[PDB]
């Protein structure tokens, strides 16, 4: 089903919650800015086509709570991503499209 991922947990941690989501090809994932802004979504290119990873990324930073970004995943695969400003804190995620 379509998935919603919180950027910054309710418990106040620099994480994507849930960190791993599984969807069906053709579905979308919406990231909603929650706590400890700012955040962004950058997909790494290992295991998936470099250009697809780029098209799925949203490099602009989100500041206000409730702001969101949506990406539609039409091709099956394992897409790992991260929040640039919080990479050191380990704010990483994964989307499995089947």
Pick the catalytic residue from 15, 41, 48, 83. 83
Check binding of 44 to a copy of itself (CB under 8 A): no
User: 86 a known binding residue?
Assistant: yes
Q: Is 71 in the site for a copy of itself (CB under 8 A)?
A: yes
Using CB under 5 A as the binding rule, whether residue 16 contacts Cu ion is answered as no
Catalytic residue of the set 7, 81, 86, 95: 86
Specify the stretch interacting with a copy of itself by CB under 8 A; choose among 9-17, 41-49, 61-69, 89-97.
61-69
Is residue 84 within 8 A of residue 9, CB to CB? The reply is no
DSSP annotation string for 11-71: TS-SSEESSEEEE-TT-EEEEEE-SS--EEEEE--SSS-HHHHHHH-EEEEE-STT-EEEE
Consult the annotation and say whether 83 binds a ligand.
yes
SS3 96: strand
Nearer to a copy of itself, 27 or 44 (CB): 27
Q: Hey, which residues does 72 pair with through a beta bridge? A: 28
Q: Which residues are catalytic?
A: 39, 83, 86, 91
């Amino acid at each position: 089903a379509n998935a919603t991922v919180k950027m910054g947990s309710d418990s106040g941690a620099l994480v994507f919650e849930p960190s791993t989501v599984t969807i069906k090809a053709g579905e979308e994932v919406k990231w909603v800015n929650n706590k400890l802004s700012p955040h962004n979504i950058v997909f790494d290119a290992d295991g998936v086509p470099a250009d697809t990873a780029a098209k799925l990324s949203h490099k602009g930073l989100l500041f206000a709570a409730g702001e969101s970004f949506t990406s539609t995943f039409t091709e099956p695969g394992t897409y790992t991503y991260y929040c640039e400003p919080h990479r050191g804190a380990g704010m990483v995620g994964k989307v499995v499209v089947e």
